[PDB]
Amino acid sequence: VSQLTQFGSTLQNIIERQDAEALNALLQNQAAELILTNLSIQDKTIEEL
């Protein structure tokens, strides 16, 4: 049983880690998508000048 509890603590640590790393990759894909509109806005500011 004490061996099983040790697998349970390793498993909880893995679950927490992998879910947080999937969030880390989500925030990068989301800022990569947000940048394009800023490029379009800056380009139209040049045409305004």
Partner: protein, 49 residues
């Protein structure tokens, strides 16, 4: 001599109306470009939305 001086008066007056008409036309012309710049500025505000 008074007939001649009246004639020269009417001529000088007409030239001053060229100065005024050209000034009005130039102001009209610059307003259109002001509208073009504002049309861009509005496209950039829709894009910010």
């Amino acid at each position: 001599a008074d007939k001649i001086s009246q004639s020269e008066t009417y001529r000088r007056r007409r030239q001053e109306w060229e100065i005024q008409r050209n000034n009005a036309e130039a102001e009209l012309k610059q307003i259109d470009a002001q509208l073009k710049s504002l049309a861009v500025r509005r496209e950039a505000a829709v894009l910010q939305k």
